[PDB]
Paper text:
The yeast SWR1 complex catalyses the exchange of histone H2A–H2B dimers in nucleosomes, with Htz1–H2B dimers. SWR1 is a 14-subunit complex that is a member of the INO80 remodeller family.
The second structure (configuration II) also showed a longer section of DNA overhang bound to SWR1, but this time, it was the DNA that extended from the upper gyre, which is released from Arp6–Swc6, that now binds across the same surface of SWR1 as the DNA from the lower gyre in configuration I. The DNA overhang from the lower gyre is released in this structure. Thus, the same DNA-binding surface on SWR1 binds different overhangs in each structure. A third contact region, involving eight conserved basic residues (K319–K322, R325, K326, K328 and K329), are in a loop that sits across the surface of the SWR1 complex. This surface contacts the DNA overhang adjacent to the nucleosome wrap, but a different overhang in structures emanating from either the lower (configuration I) or the upper (configuration II) DNA gyre. By swapping which DNA overhang is bound to SWR1, and then releasing the nucleosome but without releasing the DNA overhang, the nucleosome can flip and rebind in the opposite orientation but remain tethered to SWR1 by the DNA contact with the Swc2 subunit. Consequently, we interpret that the two major states that we observed by cryo-EM represent intermediates on the flipping pathway.
Numbering used by the authors:
A (entry chain C): 21 to 102
B (entry chain D): 23 to 102
C (entry chain E): 79 to 118
D (entry chain B), E (entry chain A): 37 to 133
F (entry chain M): 783 to 831
Write the structure that this text describes.
Amino acid sequence: ILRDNIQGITKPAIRRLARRGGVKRISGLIYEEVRAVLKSFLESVIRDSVTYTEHAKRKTVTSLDVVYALKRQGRTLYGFGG
Amino acid sequence: RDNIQGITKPAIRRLARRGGVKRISGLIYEEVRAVLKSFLESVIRDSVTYTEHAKRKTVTSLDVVYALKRQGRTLYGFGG
Amino acid sequence: IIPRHLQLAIRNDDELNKLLGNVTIAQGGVLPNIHQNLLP
Amino acid sequence: KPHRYKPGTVALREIRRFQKSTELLIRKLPFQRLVREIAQDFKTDLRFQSSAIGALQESVEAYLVSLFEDTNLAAIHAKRVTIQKKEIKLARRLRGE
Amino acid sequence: KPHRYKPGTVALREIRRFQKSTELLIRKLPFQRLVREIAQDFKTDLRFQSSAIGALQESVEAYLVSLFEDTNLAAIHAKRVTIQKKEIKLARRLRGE
Amino acid sequence: RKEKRKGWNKPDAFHVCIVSYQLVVQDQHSFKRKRWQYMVLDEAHNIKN
DNA sequence: TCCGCGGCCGCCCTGGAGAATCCCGGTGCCGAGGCCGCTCAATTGGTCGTAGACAGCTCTAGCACCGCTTAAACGCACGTACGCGCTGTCCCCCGCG
DNA sequence: CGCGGGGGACAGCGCGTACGTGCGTTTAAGCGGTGCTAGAGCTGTCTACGACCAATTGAGCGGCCTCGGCACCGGGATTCTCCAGGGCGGCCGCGGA
């Protein structure tokens, strides 16, 4: 729950995700590098989310909070709380 | 007439040299010319739209700046 | 509706896809495009 | 002889299935453990509601699927079909990330 | 003994010279009447001022040079010394276009 | 289970099948379609909730 | 030199086989949208203002050309060297338990 | 997590030609000037043209509950593909007169 859960996105999970990109073979070192990329993106989103949460005088983080966090990325298409 | 060909083959060769390519394919010159045409048409449709809105027959620097603003280019310097 | 309908409506329309396609699709999935060099 | 399919044969009907079906493909509880373990560092003891978790996984899944499609396009551009580290880094760099 | 340099090194010296000098690579009047032609079809009887056109040429040159740099990075990705059409299309498409 | 239920297609099939509690709970969707005659529940104390 | 013939015999075509197809129904289940309350800001009227182009001077530089002076382009001829073709190698993750 | 293996990633070397670089000679732009006139623009102005709350109001919603549709296998040749013999691309070699 709070210790070494980065393996939640597992190697078979990464292989299945790469199946959706249209690839036949996934190399061994692909899994951990895409894990690091996902970690970086998730950290970048959640930093903005938690900073907004602190600004809003709120203790809980809502879905619309991360919606605004991703809003300044610059696309903002459909989704919950759009 | 035929003014797009005014950009010469040695000019595109130097431009690709700026891109750090030792040997450049022959079709690459005309492909670069074609993507340049697409770039200019995408910019200039918006520029002409803004010119027509602006109640002005002359395309000003601010006109080009506003045309470039929407497409995400956001240039600096000229009309900044 | 299933959000797959939303994804099909978005991706089958050229202007919608050209306009914006990065932010999450709400359970609509994607359109996995395959190539002609993979499958035997 | 056993009906051993050649590699790349089942993939046809498999992509026929999962292109139409639109369910999830990642274990939920490990993912919520991950989002917790990354949240406590930013803010401990967060009282997570039932929401604000599925949106994150859907967003990251869409982003990584787009990245994987771009990586496959780069691999085909590289006169090959398989994925590799260089394909991923090139796709990410050309995406502005 | 004619003095003919081996191919490739003069390319490097040209690259260095174009790196030190940051002048416009396309003559002003060619861009002028190219813009005039491409604006003829949209609306007729349009007069272009002295300004607003050097900005167009500098923006086009800068973004096209960035595209060339991405294309060359993808060419090194492809392990070759030549630019290719698939290189250019991968550079364009993966940039959100 | 697919091999077991491949022969389940025939009408006038096996006179009886045996499936446990949680297996029935999981495969209710597969089982709800077929019509039966005699259902037997064992140790009804465990099913008291 | 003819060519009879015999061998290396192994490969696309053909027949057999493995799993899925996406509807016909069964059984079971599933929250849209109109309907007793409602509410509440919208819709005209009257007042308030105000500023923003109609003229009108204004002002200032666009521009098309007249007339010299070069600048990279262009063709060609040879260099060469590296993508590509052709081929060989090895490799390690897909399919399955 | 484990193993067979086979299509696919990756490299070595010849081709040769495809740009690349060094010869002359241009086609059209840069610069000096100019004479104008044609578009860009704020000031008296004055009016019409937008905003907001009284009497009403309608209109869409707040909440439930029916029911014609969701989910997918009994039910299954064909599609999708994979793998073993047959005639063959013939290939080719070797030897009496």
